[PDB]
Amino acid sequence: MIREERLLKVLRAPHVSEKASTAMEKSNTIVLKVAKDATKAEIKAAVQKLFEVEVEVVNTLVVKGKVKRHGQRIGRRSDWKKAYVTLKEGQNLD
Template sequence: MSTERLLQVLLAPIVTEKATFVADKNQQIAFRVVPDATKPEIKAAVELLFKAEVESVQVLNTKGKQKRFGRFIGRRRNERKAYVCLKEGQEIDFAQEVK
């Protein structure tokens, strides 16, 4: 796995009420990832970017819902989410400055 690929795997952390609840209860962080990302790639990307040890990765695909935007019918995007379980004592601080 190249470093360039690993830097592109993670798109954004998911900051929702459900994701925060899961993070507090199970020591898991939710990320939006590229559609063709594999579990080993996601694990390596988190360890590279955040210097935190990963215990396991769970991945799920969600289909975008069909929604109306005024009188037009549109579609939300399909997403691939990764729930990354960190080892005991590890944590990710999104507020710290990356150097």
């Protein structure tokens, strides 16, 4: 049982990319940016409540931040957690 408030905080964004699109189309799997602390179960819960859609399974991974250079000064982008969430057969997501 995850708290409503917690759930709302978990899910950061949808991730747009070719791969993501492919996943959506073929495998019925949505690619989300989620909180770095968000566990799989929590993510699933969030998905179910907040998008109103049955979840088969969630795979997560941590994306490491790229090191960049703004002019002369070096600086690193933040790490962030990506989640492939596979929706059950016949579940169409808006």
